[PDB]
Amino acid sequence: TDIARHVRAKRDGCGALELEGVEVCVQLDDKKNIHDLIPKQPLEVHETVAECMILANHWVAKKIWESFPH
RNA sequence: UUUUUUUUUUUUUUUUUUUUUUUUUUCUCCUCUUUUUUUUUUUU
Numbered sequence: 078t079d080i081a082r083h084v085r086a087k088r089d090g091c092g093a094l095e096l097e098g099v100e101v102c103v104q105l106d107d108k109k110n111i112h113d114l115i116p117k118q119p120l121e122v123h124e125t126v127a128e129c130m131i132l133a134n135h136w137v138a139k140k141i142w143e144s145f146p147h
Numbered sequence: 148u149u150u151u152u153u154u155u156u157u158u159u160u161u162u163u164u165u166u167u168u169u170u171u172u173u174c175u176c177c178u179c180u181u182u183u184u185u186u187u188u189u190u191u
Contacts, residue, residue, distance in 0.1 A: 096188070119189075127189040 081125035084132055095124075 102117045 094187075098188080123190050130189080 078125065081128055084128050085124070088128065088132070 097119060100117055102115055104112050104115070106112050
C-alpha cells in the first residue's frame with residue numbers, strides 16, 4: 078500500500094493523465110441469463126497494481142532499449 | 148349253336164461378339180436518418 082501510494086506520489090508530481098471508461102460487467106447464472114447488470118468501478122488496489130506494473134514495464138523497456146538500439 | 152383281322156408316344160445339337168458416372172435453359176431487381184468514425188490507462 079505504502080510503496081504504491083508513493084510511487085503514485087512521485088509519478089504524479091511528474092503528472093500523468095488518469096481518466097476512465099464507460100465499462101459495465103455482467104453476471105450469468107446457471108440458466109446463463111441476466112440476473113442483473115452492474116456498473117463496475119476503479120478500485121484503490123487496481124490503481125496500486127497498475128502503477129507497480131507501469132514502473133515495472135517501464136524499467137523493462139528502458140533496459141531493452143539501451144540494450145538493443147534498433 | 149355266334150368264327151377271323153384292323154402298326155405307334157418329332158428327327159437334331161460339339162454357337163462368335165473387342166464397353167463405362169452424367170446427358171438439355173428462365174430476365175432486370177430503391178437496404179430510411181445524432182455524427183465525426185471511438186481509440187491512452189489498469190485489473191483476465
